[PDB]
Amino acid sequence: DFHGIDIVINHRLKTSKTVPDLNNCKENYEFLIKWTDESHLHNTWETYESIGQVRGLKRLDNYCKQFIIEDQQVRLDPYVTAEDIEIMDMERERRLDEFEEFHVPERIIDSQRASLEDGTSQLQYLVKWRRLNYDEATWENATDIVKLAPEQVKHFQNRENSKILPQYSSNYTSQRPRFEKLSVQPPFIKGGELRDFQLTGINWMAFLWSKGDNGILADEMGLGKTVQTVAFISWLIFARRQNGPHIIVVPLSTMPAWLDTFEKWAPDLNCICYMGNQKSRDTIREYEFYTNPKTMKFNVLLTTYEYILKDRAELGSIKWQFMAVDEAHRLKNAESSLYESLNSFKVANRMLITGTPLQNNIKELAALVNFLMPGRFNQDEEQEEYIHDLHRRIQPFILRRLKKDVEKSLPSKTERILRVELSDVQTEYYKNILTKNYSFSLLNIMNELKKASNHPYLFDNAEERVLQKFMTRENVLRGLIMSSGKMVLLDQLLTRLKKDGHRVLIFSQMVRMLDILGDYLSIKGINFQRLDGTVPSAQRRISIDHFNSPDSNDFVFLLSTRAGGLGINLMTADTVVIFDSDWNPQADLQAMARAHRIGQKNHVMVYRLVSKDTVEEEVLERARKKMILEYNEPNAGELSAILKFGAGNMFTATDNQKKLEDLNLDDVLNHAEDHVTTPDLGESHLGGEEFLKQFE
Numbered sequence: 035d036f037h038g039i040d041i042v043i044n045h046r047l048k049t050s051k052t053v054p055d056l057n058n059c060k061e062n063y064e065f066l067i068k069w070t071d072e073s074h075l076h077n078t079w080e081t082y083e084s085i086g087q088v089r090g091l092k093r094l095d096n097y098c099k100q101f102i103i104e105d106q107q108v109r110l111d112p113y114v115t116a117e118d119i120e121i122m123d124m125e126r127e128r129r130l131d132e133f134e135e136f137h138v139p140e141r142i143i144d145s146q147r148a149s150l151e152d153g154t155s156q157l158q159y160l161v162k163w164r165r166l167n168y169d170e171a172t173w174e175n176a177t178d179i180v181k182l183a184p185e186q187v188k189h190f191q192n193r194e195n196s197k198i199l200p201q202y203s204s205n206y207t208s209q210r211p212r213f214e215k216l217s218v219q220p221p222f223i224k225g226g227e228l229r230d231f232q233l234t235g236i237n238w239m240a241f242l243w244s245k246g247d248n249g250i251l252a253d254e255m256g257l258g259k260t261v262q263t264v265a266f267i268s269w270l271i272f273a274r275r276q277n278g279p280h281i282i283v284v285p286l287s288t289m290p291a292w293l294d295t296f297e298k299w300a301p302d303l304n305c306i307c308y309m310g311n312q313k314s315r316d317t318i319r320e321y322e323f324y325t326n327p328k329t330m331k332f333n334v335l336l337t338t339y340e341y342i343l344k345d346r347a348e349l350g351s352i353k354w355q356f357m358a359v360d361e362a363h364r365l366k367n368a369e370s371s372l373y374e375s376l377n378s379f380k381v382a383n384r385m386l387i388t389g390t391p392l393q394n395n396i397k398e399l400a401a402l403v404n405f406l407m408p409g410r411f412n413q414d415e416e417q418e419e420y421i422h423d424l425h426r427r428i429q430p431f432i433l434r435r436l437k438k439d440v441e442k443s444l445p446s447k448t449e450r451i452l453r454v455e456l457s458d459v460q461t462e463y464y465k466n467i468l469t470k471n472y473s474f475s476l477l478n479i480m481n482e483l484k485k486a487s488n489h490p491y492l493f494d495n496a497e498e499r500v501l502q503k504f505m506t507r508e509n510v511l512r513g514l515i516m517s518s519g520k521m522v523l524l525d526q527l528l529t530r531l532k533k534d535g536h537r538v539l540i541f542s543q544m545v546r547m548l549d550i551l552g553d554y555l556s557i558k559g560i561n562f563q564r565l566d567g568t569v570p571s572a573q574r575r576i577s578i579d580h581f582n583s584p585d586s587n588d589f590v591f592l593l594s595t596r597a598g599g600l601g602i603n604l605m606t607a608d609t610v611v612i613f614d615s616d617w618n619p620q621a622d623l624q625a626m627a628r629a630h631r632i633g634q635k636n637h638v639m640v641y642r643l644v645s646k647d648t649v650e651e652e653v654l655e656r657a658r659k660k661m662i663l664e665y666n667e668p669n670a671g672e673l674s675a676i677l678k679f680g681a682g683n684m685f686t687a688t689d690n691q692k693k694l695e696d697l698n699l700d701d702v703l704n705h706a707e708d709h710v711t712t713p714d715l716g717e718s719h720l721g722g723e724e725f726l727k728q729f730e
């Protein structure tokens with residue numbers, strides 16, 4: 035009824051200036067439109083006079099006002115950094131990449147053929163839109179859905195036959211099946227792999243079920259503990275044929291995650307997301323059960339804690355088999371309505387997830403245990419043994435492994451901090467920049483130093499000034515390398531590891547700096563490409579695929595640090611360089627794990643570069659010290675400190691050059707620090723005393 039403009043997605047050029055005004059827009063562009071009373075396949079490429087009179091029309095103009103005009107305007111400002119731009123760029127991307135998800139269908143809810151205004155009737159569905167929500171799902175024409183979304187359809191019909199429905203569940207009376215052991219991953223888990231330590235995992239949760247005991251998965255974060263739940267569900271269903279209704283509780287941050295993981299490793303499963311509190315609640319009830327006013331038609335549902343109260347009412351009275359919960363450090367508390375309402379639930383079983391063993395908590399120690407098993411349990415010496423007893427007293431219910439325990443299983447790596455002097459040049463630059471000041475601005479001041487520390491060429495007269503020796507090309511490198519602490523080092527670092535054929539990644543904050551290496555490499559004659567927000571998706575894939583080319587001649591590959599946070603896999607490199615790092619260390623690890631990507635085949639060597647007695651190390655010693663408190667810019671406040679000395683202890687220039695002069699790679703590397711980035715993780719709880727018996 036209310037027909038016209040839901041929202042405006044995009045725009046472009048046509049069939050043939052730089053600061054445009056509305057009129058330009060109006061005249062040179064077609065625009066993308068989700069119409070109201072519609073959905074995202076029904077987006078059209080229209081122009082002003084191709085659409086005409088339509089309700090809430092202004093809200094289109096408003097798009098130009100911001101996304102063409104005032105965006106394009108804003109860029110001009112010379113204080114807008116290059117760095118700044120690529121953000122604005124990666125930004126468009128991110129937005130329009132979300133929209134691309136709304137004509138990707140993920141479920142189907144009702145085969146219900148609709149009569150049409152002829153005498154004709156087509157089979158129309160009822161489509162759940164990915165990244166979208168339960169409110170706002172649309173009936174759409176079968177005929178073309180299917181030729182777009184075969185499986186989710188294929189799934190649909192099966193979705194009410196599926197052998198694995200909930201009531202075909204086998205319910206163990208006096209007894210319950212023998213504990214067993216699976217030395218190889220059972221076919222019915224169809225995703226891909228799972229390193230032995232994965233198997234071992236499921237085995238454990240398994241064996242435990244076949245004791246009637248629930249346990250806790252606390253292996254250090256990012257460690258597969260999702261796949262390890264997913265898988266272990268497949269088992270409950272497909273291996274103890276009981277699979278009534280299952281429920282996993284999740285961080286809203288990561289449910290988009292789980293969902294993929296499911297239709298990756300347990301594709302055949304019928305699992306249900308719980309997003310929306312309003313029109314969802316009501317929508318879902320029309321999907322969850324069977325058509326009658328108590329057949330639950332779904333294998334697995336998933337939520338945020340949120341809906342465990344807004345909807346404890348309905349959910350409370352549901353007969354549940356298995357319950358897990360991710361990043362559930364969240365439930366140390368015994369009053370928090372999670373607890374009170376999760377015990378308000380009917381569960382045969384509990385797996386629990388956290389990346390942590392308890393220390394302090396005595397009451398937490400209780401609340402967690404007393405949650406998953408309602409049947410458990412002075413001078414400071416006496417509260418110290420009690421916590422220590424009840425420590426071991428629950429060894430059997432814990433699984434905890436760390437990096438080192440699965441080093442055999444995984445692409446090990448190695449973070450080294452190579453710290454260099456500043457070139458005689460750099461020194462003097464720094465040192466002068468200092469002079470000028472202390473007389474939000476502090477920022478560029480930081481920047482100038484940051485720049486100085488990386489390379490003098492970032493600055494304007496630099497190169498011109500350096501080479502007062504006229505104009506030769508050998509020389510152009512000669513000064514280009516040697517005026518820079520980092521470069522000098524790096525120079526023979528490549529030289530050397532490019533003798534060992536190490537395929538090499540390099541990141542920086544400063545795209546300008548990238549340019550400069552960009553220079554370096556072409557002069558030296560080395561193959562590579564460059565990346566960052568500037569190059570459009572379309573492009574990227576090609577600078578990428580050429581590096582990962584079956585036997586490519588690219589033997590290095592430049593990137594923005596922010597480029598990293600992308601989603602881009604370059605395992606074809608065995609070695610990462612951080613030229614310089616962020617307020618945020620994670621930004622560096624994102625970028626790291628573009629070759630630390632859990633389908634890596636080498637040992638990954640990671641060199642973080644810092645210049646000695648520079649502000650640089652304060653930024654990095656900051657990084658760690660935050661990025662230990664775990665599981666994007668320095669404060670103006672704190673910033674005062676970080677700058678306000680490092681200045682006269684910054685020694686000679688000609689000294690520093692002397693150092694650089696006959697610097698030796700090896701020493702630098704055998705002197706190299708280590709970047710310590712993990713609270714001592716505690717000890718490995720490698721399984722339950724019992725279980726262990728059954729494996730050897």
Ligand SMILES: Nc1ncnc2c1ncn2[C@@H]1O[C@H](COP(=O)(O)OP(=O)(O)OP(O)(O)=S)[C@@H](O)[C@H]1O
Pocket residue numbers: 226227228229232254255256257258259260261360361387388389632
């Ligand atoms: N066998 C596997 N094959 C391929 N990818 C895997 C495997 N196991 C884990 N992963 C991936 O490793 C990445 C990080 O693992 P996650 O399962 O998200 O970590 P996690 O231990 O669940 O962390 P949480 O949920 O915060 S405690 C994910 O992209 C997983 O899909």
